[PDB]
Curated annotation (Swiss-Prot), chain A:
Known disease link: Sveinsson chorioretinal atrophy: Characterized by symmetrical lesions radiating from the optic disk involving the retina and the choroid.
Protein name (record): Transcriptional enhancer factor TEF-1
Source taxon at top rank: Eukaryota
Function, in words: Transcription factor which plays a key role in the Hippo signaling pathway, a pathway involved in organ size control and tumor suppression by restricting proliferation and promoting apoptosis. The core of this pathway is composed of a kinase cascade wherein MST1/MST2, in complex with its regulatory protein SAV1, phosphorylates and activates LATS1/2 in complex with its regulatory protein MOB1, which in turn phosphorylates and inactivates YAP1 oncoprotein and WWTR1/TAZ.
Tissue expression from the record: Preferentially expressed in skeletal muscle. Lower levels in pancreas, placenta, and heart.
Organism: Homo sapiens
PTM field: Lactylation by AARS1 promotes nuclear localization and stabilization of YAP1, leading to increased Hippo signaling pathway. Delactylated by SIRT1.
Effect recorded for residue 203 to A: Important loss of interaction with YAP1
Segments of this protein annotated with the region Transcriptional activation: 1-208
UniProt subcellular location: Nucleus
Subunit comment: Interacts with YAP1 and WWTR1/TAZ.
UniProtKB/Swiss-Prot annotation, chain B:
Residue span relative to the full protein: 51 to 100 of 504
S-S bonds: none
Residues annotated with Phosphoserine modification: 11
UniProt-recorded name of the protein: Transcriptional coactivator YAP1
Residue numbers of Phosphothreonine PTMs: 13
Consequence of substituting residue 34 to A: Reduced interaction with TEAD4 and transforming ability
Amino acid sequence: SIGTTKLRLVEFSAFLEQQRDPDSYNKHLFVHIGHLESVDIRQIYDKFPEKKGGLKELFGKGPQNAFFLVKFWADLNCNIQDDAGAFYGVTSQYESSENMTVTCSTKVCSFGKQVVEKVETEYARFENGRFVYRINRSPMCEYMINFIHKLKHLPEKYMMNSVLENFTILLVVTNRDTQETLLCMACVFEVSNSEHGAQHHIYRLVKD
Amino acid sequence: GHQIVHVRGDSETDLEALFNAVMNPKTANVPQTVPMRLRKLPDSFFKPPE
């Protein structure tokens, strides 16, 4: 039950596709949602940008039950083929009961500053009697792609986890016409050591 | 669907900054913060599910 009635994130997926040759296709998921405990949002204010339109400014600007914290264990165990063209992309699907203009902003934040902001505009599509906004194979920034490569060459995962300490992503979906916050998803990462695959905990953000 | 990406000028430098904060903390000159392990966070935050 992630998201409000205004807009509900049902699917999230960051992936690497590889085409070694015309007969060979490979897809690797780094993280995936869609295939609750609460956290005091003030504890994670020292990890996200709290300036104009910051995780703090938005908290009071819109509904508090639209704010979520996700801890990802990313799956980095993927053999990056050196002879194959590779698409690094992000597919996210949001389902709503109302038709509104939807703008999704994905910001990669290092320390307290967001290095890269990507703004995607989506429109309601009527499927199975509801309005669905879906971003299809959206390309990740060169920053994210380089970041994954730089992580890979680290010798140990505890080193990977250490650099991820100061890495966060803030995902804010907003009604463009009303500027109302529809969904806000604050993202924190370790590297999954699980053989089975990537894991993820979702927490509702609260204040006290 | 329009994907406009906003990049600040020192992205790749910062990317290195993210790393050599760990790989040589002294020659880093990076903001400092409380590690997540030491924050008031649920126990789950560091034990992945099964």
